[PDB]
Design a protein around this ligand. Structure first.
Ligand code: FE
Ligand code: FE
Ligand code: MN3
Ligand code: MN3
Lengths: 284, 284
């Protein structure tokens, strides 16, 4: 009794068409490119990649209450997509772990408080609050946290950091290929979160809409502050010629795009919804 | 810092080589074959397939505490394989759900007490006891339950039921293809459970070995009784010419094979371990 015309199933079949595996990606050149990086460049690299490895793992693990919530409500279509969502997240964890393994590399809170606030406090709190009370308001706060904030701002802003480094120095071709594939999966993740927040709001009314706008405003400063957390004492040089103002500015603009996506979710036609309507990448 | 020579990573790369997706399997003939079944045959079919759909979903969901336990212990290799394990389980849920959807079909406890004892009481109890106390004894009881019992006896005995029906009546070619692929994944699931029980016993001593033997003996009668639970009042005819004694006898023998696998796990060389040493299917 599956409705294949539902929007989650559209993204579900898309995730199957655009399937990839990080074990088929050669990291030989990436290992050679590791020697091209100075110590302050390697620190910046480990900083971001480990926050990706740990963040994607936090999402893959902390998303268990939402899936249990939806299966108790008998929403088989949305449960089937979250099962694809979770595996893709763990697939992203493998991708970053294979890169760290290839370069020979074997979360402080004290130097990264914004990152810890999101992934170690606010993400597990919003998710495991569903075990306490799976209300529509807690479900929209969960969706806002892991999807629009963790992925829509933190992950997407991280992608911008990787793309700048790979094109500026012509390094890490395997990682650049990984980020493209990861950003493709994440495109469907944002669309499902937009749809999910749309369904909760259209079924729960103004009470659900307020909870989404209050939660994303509350998380906003921490999500943007994630990109103001380089390594330790800075030093004289900026690693890998990054522009700190543009990195932070991009996240702020991402945050506003996610805020406006909640405002547009009130009046959104869910039945005629297609991935192209949510600007979803439909080709690898 | 991944050890690719470890036994979990061997099965991990095997799961990637032997990857399959149930959406590429044609069920057109299966829908036509549904009309070949009498009402008592359709009931038997829905009986087993829904217990598979619900059982595989119970395993995919209730396995969250074990993965959280292993990541807190820093066992990255075993966590990476459980991530493949969980997705394959949800992939099995999709396979059975696509078959039920193709045949147009849209767990009673009262008529299936043995099935409910395993999947609705003993499986969630052994798994969520890790959240209470992730001791080595609780970890081996968890492994015995979901792996050696749920998969080694219940799932494997279910496969025997499907294979008999498909070859006796020459029906359901899509389902027969699915069961072959599912039984291939499950081959690696049993090997990892054997390895995991072996590591816990060799690191925990006699206390862990006793917990594994006490738990599988306690679950044994319920696992075998699962195959003594046809539909409702039986009637005059046996559905699909099944032999009830041979179906039950096969499960009993499966149970003893799993018991002897725990006894052999005490003296098992884990470093030289290969999939062929655990009789793992290595080709599709
Ligand atoms: Fe994502
Ligand atoms: Fe299995
Ligand atoms: Mn991801
Ligand atoms: Mn399975």
């Amino acid at each position: 009794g599956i409705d294949w015309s539902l929007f989650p199933m559209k993204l579900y079949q898309l995730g199957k068409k655009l399937f990839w595996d990080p074990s088929t990606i050669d990291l030989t050149q990436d290992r050679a490119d590791w020697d091209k990086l100075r110590d302050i460049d390697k620190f910046l690299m480990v900083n971001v990649t480990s926050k990706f490895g740990a963040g994607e793992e936090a999402v893959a693990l902390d998303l268990h209450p939402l899936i249990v919530t939806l299966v108790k409500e008998g929403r088989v279509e949305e449960v089937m997509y979250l099962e694809q969502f979770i595996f893709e997240e763990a697939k992203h964890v493998e991708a970053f772990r294979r890169f760290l393994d290839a370069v020979g590399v074997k979360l402080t809170k004290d130097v990264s408080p914004n990152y810890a606030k999101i992934f170690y406090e606010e993400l597990p709190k919003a998710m495991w609050n569903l075990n306490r009370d799976p209300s529509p308001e807690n479900q929209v706060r969960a969706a806002v946290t892991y999807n629009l904030v963790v992925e829509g701002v933190a992950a997407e802003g991280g992608y911008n950091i990787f793309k700048y480094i790979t094109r500026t120095f012509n390094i890490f071709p395997g990682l650049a290929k990984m980020v493209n594939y990861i950003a493709t999966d994440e495109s469907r993740h944002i669309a499902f979160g937009t749809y999910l927040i749309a369904r909760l709001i259209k079924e729960g009314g103004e009470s659900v809409y307020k909870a989404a706008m209050e939660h994303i405003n509350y998380l906003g400063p921490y999500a943007v502050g994630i990109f103001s957390e380089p390594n330790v004492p800075q030093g004289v040089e900026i690693p890998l010629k990054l522009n700190p103002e543009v990195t932070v500015e991009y996240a702020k603009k991402l945050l506003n795009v996610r805020i406006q996506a909640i405002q547009r979710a009130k009046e959104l036609k869910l039945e005629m919804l297609t991935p192209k309507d949510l600007d979803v990448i439909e080709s690898l």
